[PDB]
């Protein structure tokens, strides 16, 4: 899986429709290849640290994987 660790200043994305909780996040690559790009998404600027949740079924009510990692 992705597993990407966020860097300082990096955009991170959650989906208000599908995230199990507010800490559930995707890196830009996964977000842009996910169903969530068509949903009510939210972007935050990373302070660094933390990681992409692509592929975690516990993190997403729908569409846990992006097209690249599925």
């Amino acid at each position: 899986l992705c597993g990407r660790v966020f860097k300082v200043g990096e955009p991170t994305y959650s989906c208000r429709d599908c995230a199990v909780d507010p800490t559930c996040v995707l890196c830009m690559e996964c977000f842009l290849g996910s169903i969530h790009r068509d949903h009510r998404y939210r972007m935050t600027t990373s302070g660094g640290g933390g990681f992409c949740d692509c592929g975690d079924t516990e993190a997403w009510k729908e569409g846990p994987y992006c097209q690249k990692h599925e």
């Binding site: 966020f6 559930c24 996040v25 933390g50 949740d53």
Partner: peptide
């Protein structure tokens, strides 16, 4: 998840 976001940094914890």
């Amino acid at each position: 998840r976001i940094f914890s």
